[PDB]
Each structure stands twice: as structure tokens, then as C-alpha cells.
Amino acid sequence: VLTQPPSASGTPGQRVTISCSGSSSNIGSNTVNWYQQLPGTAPKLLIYSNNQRPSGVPDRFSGSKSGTSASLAISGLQSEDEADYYCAAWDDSLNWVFGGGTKLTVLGEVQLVESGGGVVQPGGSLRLSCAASGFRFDDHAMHWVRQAPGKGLEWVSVISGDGGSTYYADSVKGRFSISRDDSKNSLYLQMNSLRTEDTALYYCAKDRSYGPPDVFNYEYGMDVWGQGTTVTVSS
Amino acid sequence: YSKHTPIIVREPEDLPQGFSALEPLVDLPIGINITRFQTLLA
Amino acid sequence: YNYLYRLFRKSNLKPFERDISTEIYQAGNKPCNGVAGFNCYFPLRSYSFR
């Protein structure tokens, strides 16, 4: 569980401070990750490990981990910084807890596309596919981060680059089977026991670590996202 | 608490200068978290 | 199903105050809007017996 303000406010020119509160079981033992998502497009990584920033993220963002809570700072915000800000952290109970979102609204190259959605019969389901193009799939991990239409994001399952131990969420455990293949860049996720509460996008997110994000509590992150399919079971 | 006191005509509307104790009438129990109050007239 | 059991609340209760609730809990700041998403359920957990 992570506490995050629903929708803050602010004026252009100055700076704001978005905070994310968490217990010592998730933030106190790991590193918080801040993700930025523009309304309409796929999300993207903003701040990883609370100290470094990717090459695409400019110096307009900063993060701190003073205490058991994370603090974001955007010096000199503008109209382009009007996006959704999410907090994510790997808890010591083998799970990946995400935030709620921050509607910071102010009124003044490898493709990771996946597919395999479509409306199906309730109870059962089909397989979820994913693909890429020349990104060394063996040396990187993959995550399943679905996002319901209008709602937030949440982590479903993880597959490591080695292909050994894997982890699922607290609700999708058992009835989900994630696996890979020795062929070109791909990822298979079979779903079972469809309870019709799965209307989301199922983002096939790319990571940078190799093993499962449980032993590597300082390098785990999430690389550029991909265009996901809109699967709507709707019973 | 409640108490009726002579409020014979005086200077413009204000709290008059005079001591008057208030005796309790009802003591109904309650346990609600009350933090606001709204009045109402006929 | 005849013996109910509420779940955690974002605020502490009051002594001598009934806690009848039928809405859906909102984890953090993401309203799940009735449909149970992630970490959002109804505080009507039925006690299991044997």
C-alpha cells in the first residue's frame, strides 16, 4: 500500500513537490520508482532508484528518499509536464505495489508492441502475446503492467532474463502461467479462471535487470513501454 | 440546558447585561462524531 | 455468510458508534468505481467456519 495525493495543484514557473508515503516493508527496504504517463500515449520511466535518471529524461526532474517516503521535485514546470505520476515499489513479500497517481494539471529505439486481446467468452480466455526487435531478450526481464480504462496501473507478473524463478501478483496467482521460448523475442502469458474483472491493457513492459527483482533491490527498473492491446471481456 | 429570562425591551438587538443560570432539561445519550451545525427556521 | 467481518478503514473508529458500511474501499487515491481492481474490495469479508 502506497499513499499518494489524488490531484495536486500549482502555477507555472514555480515548482511543486509530489510525495509518496510507504511503510518500511516496501520503501524502507527497496527503492521507489517514479513513472510518468502522458494522457493517451504509453507510459515511460521517469526516475529509477531515486538517484539516477535515464538518458531521455532531462534534468527537469529530481527525487529524494528522505526517510520512509519518497519526494519528487520538478523545478520549473510547464504545460508539457501535465501528466500522470505513479509510484512503484517492490515489497519484501514478493509483490510489486504501485501508487494511485498524481493529476498535476495546470491550466496556465526498440519497439515493445504486444497483442493478443479481444473480447472472449467469460470464464475462459486466450493467450497474451508480446514481441520486440533486437533488444537482447535473454539479458533483460519483462513485466506485465495492466491498466484499466480510466483507472490506474498495477503489476501482474514478472519474468527474469535467466528464465528461472517467476512471480505473480496476489490475485492472479495460480490461474496465470507466464513463459518464454527459445525463438525470437516473444513472451507468452496464459490466463485461466476469468472472473470478468480484467478489462485492462496488459502492458508488456521491458526492464533492464537480469534476475527477478527480489535479489536486485537497487538495479530493478522499467525500460521504454510498448503499445498494448485493449482487451475488454465484459462478460 | 435551557432557561427563560425576562428580555423586556432594551437597546438595539444585543446580548443583555444580566446573570441567568441554565438548568438541564434532557440528557439523552449520543455517540456521534459531531463537528458542524446547521440552523433552520419555519 | 450470516456472520460478517469488516475490513481495514483509512480512519479510526469512534467509541459507541456503529460502523455500518456498504461502499467499496479506495486504496490510496485510485477509485475503483465499484468493480474490484487491485487492493480495492468490499469490507464485507465473510468469516469461514468448519
UniProtKB/Swiss-Prot annotation, chain C:
Q: What is the effect of changing residue 4 to R?
A: In strain: Delta/B.1.617.2, Epsilon/B.1.427/B.1.429, Kappa/B.1.617.1, Lambda/C.37, 19B/501Y, Omicron/BA.4, Omicron/BA.5, Omicron/BQ.1.1; Contributes to cellular immunity evasion and increases infectivity
Q: What is the lineage of its organism?
A: Viruses, Riboviria, Orthornavirae, Pisuviricota, Pisoniviricetes
First and last residue shown, out of the full length, are 449 to 498 of 1273
Oligomer and partners:
Binds to host ACE2. RBD also interacts with the N-linked glycan on 'Asn-90' of ACE2. Cleavage of S generates a polybasic C-terminal sequence on S1 that binds to host Neuropilin-1 (NRP1) and Neuropilin-2 (NRP2) receptors. Interacts with host integrin alpha-5/beta-1 (ITGA5:ITGB1) and with ACE2 in complex with integrin alpha-5/beta-1 (ITGA5:ITGB1). May interact via cytoplasmic c-terminus with M protein. May interact (via N-terminus) with host bilirubin and biliverdin, thereby preventing antibody binding to the SARS-CoV-2 spike NTD via an allosteric mechanism.
Free-text function comment from the UniProt entry: Attaches the virion to the cell membrane by interacting with host receptor, initiating the infection. The major receptor is host ACE2. When S2/S2' has been cleaved, binding to the receptor triggers direct fusion at the cell membrane. When S2/S2' has not been cleaved, binding to the receptor results in internalization of the virus by endocytosis using host TFRC and GRM2 and leading to fusion of the virion membrane with the host endosomal membrane. Alternatively, may use NRP1/NRP2 and integrin as entry receptors.
> What's this protein's name?
Spike protein S1
- Report disulfide bridges, numbered on this chain: 32-40
Region (Disordered) residue ranges read 7-42
Q: What is the effect of changing residue 5 to F?
A: In strain: B.1.1.298
Which region ranges are annotated with the description Immunodominant HLA epitope recognized by the CD8+? Answer: 1-8
Q: Where is this region: Receptor-binding motif?
A: 1-50
Q: Which domain of life is it from?
A: Viruses
